[PDB]
Amino acid sequence: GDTKEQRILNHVLQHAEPGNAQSVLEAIDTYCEQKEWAMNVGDKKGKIVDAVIQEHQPSVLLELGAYCGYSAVRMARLLSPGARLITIEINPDCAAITQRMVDFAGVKDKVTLVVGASQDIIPQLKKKYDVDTLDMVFLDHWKDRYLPDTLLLEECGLLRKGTVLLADNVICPGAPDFLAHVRGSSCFECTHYQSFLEYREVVDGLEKAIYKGP
Numbered sequence: 001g002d003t004k005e006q007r008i009l010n011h012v013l014q015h016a017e018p019g020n021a022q023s024v025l026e027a028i029d030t031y032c033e034q035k036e037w038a039m040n041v042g043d044k045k046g047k048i049v050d051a052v053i054q055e056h057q058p059s060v061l062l063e064l065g066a067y068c069g070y071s072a073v074r075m076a077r078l079l080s081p082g083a084r085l086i087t088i089e090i091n092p093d094c095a096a097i098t099q100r101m102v103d104f105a106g107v108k109d110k111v112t113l114v115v116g117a118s119q120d121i122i123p124q125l126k127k128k129y130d131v132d133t134l135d136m137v138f139l140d141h142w143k144d145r146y147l148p149d150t151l152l153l154e155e156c157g158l159l160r161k162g163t164v165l166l167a168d169n170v171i172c173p174g175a176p177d178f179l180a181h182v183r184g185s186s187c188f189e190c191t192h193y194q195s196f197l198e199y200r201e202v203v204d205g206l207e208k209a210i211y212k213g214p
């Protein structure tokens with residue numbers, strides 16, 4: 001047998017142009033639109049993600065929740081040389097697929113995949129992964145981790161003035177306690193981007209929360 005994630009990877013390996021990141025993204029989106037839905041950020045919201053990367057030019061980017069590597073590829077393809085994306089994924093099998101997806105897309109030099117929980121890995125980023133501070137963080141893992149991982153990042157001293165937090169799904173499935181914290185707090189400048197749930201007409205949005213310092 002096989003899983004949906006293997007089926008998404010199979011489709012890419014069989015239909016996308018090796019080494020072409022845009023091709024990989026289109027192959028994934030077309031499969032998911034036409035065959036089976038999957039929780040990739042997708043093309044519509046992906047464009048908003050692209051604009052934030054192009055606007056902030058992060059050199060150290062952290063991703064929470066990699067899944068099949070769609071957003072990893074989507075973001076890594078826009079990064080300058082020497083820039084690095086660190087992506088954390090709790091599921092080893094998804095991490096295996098993400099790694100292959102990133103290899104096939106031609107952006108493996110930009111990506112550092114870590115297998116483990118965000119809450120476990122975040123306190124190790126300075127000692128084990130040579131991070132000083134993060135330039136940007138994409139939050140797209142289980143929504144109940146959004147707030148406590150944000151607080152962890154802050155407490156571990158990983159945020160600096162101008163650090164960009166970008167969170168998917170803040171409307172659907174939703175991340176209300178995260179939104180309340182960053183929107184109510186004097187330590188964050190927030191912007192909401194309304195859009196649509198990936199592959200659907202259900203309304204969703206992302207939240208951009210710029211850390212203003214402690």
Ligand SMILES: C[S@@+](CC[C@H](N)C(=O)[O-])C[C@H]1O[C@@H](n2cnc3c(N)ncnc32)[C@H](O)[C@@H]1O
Pocket residue numbers: 039040041042064065066067068069070071072088089090091094116117118119140141142145
């Ligand atoms: C929505 S998918 C990520 C999709 C990816 N960002 C994209 O757009 O292509 C959610 C992922 O986060 C992972 N996840 C959930 N909780 C996590 C945690 N605490 N630490 C790391 N990964 C987690 C899940 O296993 C799943 O692969």
Ligand SMILES: O=[N+]([O-])c1cc(O)c(O)c([N+](=O)[O-])c1
Pocket residue numbers: 039040041140141142143168169172173197198
């Ligand atoms: O259920 N969904 O439609 C989604 C969508 C998403 O974009 C998700 O990131 C998600 N999740 O991580 O739980 C779930």
Ligand SMILES: [K+]
Pocket residue numbers: 182183184185186187188189190
């Ligand atoms: K605020």
Ligand SMILES: [Mg+2]
Pocket residue numbers: 039040041140168169
């Ligand atoms: Mg999502």
